[PDB]
Amino acid sequence: KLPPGWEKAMSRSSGRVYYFNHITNASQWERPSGEPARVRCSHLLVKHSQSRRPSSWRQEKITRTKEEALELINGYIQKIKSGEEDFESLASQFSDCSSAKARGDLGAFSRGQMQKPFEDASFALRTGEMSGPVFTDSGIHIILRTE
Numbered sequence: 001k002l003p004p005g006w007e008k009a010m011s012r013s014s015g016r017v018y019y020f021n022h023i024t025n026a027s028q029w030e031r032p033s034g035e036p037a038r039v040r041c042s043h044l045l046v047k048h049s050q051s052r053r054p055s056s057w058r059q060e061k062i063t064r065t066k067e068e069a070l071e072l073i074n075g076y077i078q079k080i081k082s083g084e085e086d087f088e089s090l091a092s093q094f095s096d097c098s099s100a101k102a103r104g105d106l107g108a109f110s111r112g113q114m115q116k117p118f119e120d121a122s123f124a125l126r127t128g129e130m131s132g133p134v135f136t137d138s139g140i141h142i143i144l145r146t147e
């Protein structure tokens with residue numbers, strides 16, 4: 001039926017069908033469109049107190065809760081989807097990953113290099129697509145597949 005990871009669901013608030021991807025946590029109204037040795041991704045990381053390393057270039061001691069991290073991630077996704085902000089702009093300003101200085105770009109990678117949920121989401125994204133919140137031991141990620 002649908003590309004890897006996609007399923008149909010019903011909006012609680014509207015009653016209209018939508019599509020959700022359980023690998024990437026992406027969700028959208030439109031039916032999803034249409035694997036490579038490597039992908040290229042950018043990400044925005046929000047760390048929390050249970051991150052493997054609760055520290056970043058933004059904050060020496062990261063104290064926010066995982067739930068608070070998820071709310072930040074949700075808010076960034078909303079601004080990216082509305083066009084109010086660009087992913088690259090938000091990553092540069094707010095990613096707790098040092099890749100913030102490269103607008104979140106991580107370069108190209110294969111399977112067997114990244115943390116597993118990150119890898120799975122990255123390879124399930126089509127070129128140009130963005131994930132929903134993806135959880136790893138680093139924190140919570142928004143992932144943008146660029147190649």
Ligand SMILES: Cn1nc(CO)c2ccccc21
Nearest residue numbers: 098099100101102105106107
């Ligand atoms: C961890 N990481 N990975 C990349 C790849 O762009 C990068 C670039 C600048 C700073 C930190 C970085």
Ligand SMILES: Cn1nc(CO)c2ccccc21
Nearest residue numbers: 098099102105106107108109
């Ligand atoms: C600048 N740069 N680039 C990469 C991966 O390409 C990387 C990984 C760890 C730290 C810095 C890094």
Ligand SMILES: Cn1nc(CO)c2ccccc21
Nearest residue numbers: 097106113114115118136138
């Ligand atoms: C080893 N590894 N795994 C991930 C996935 O979060 C990651 C992100 C940035 C730099 C290195 C990284």
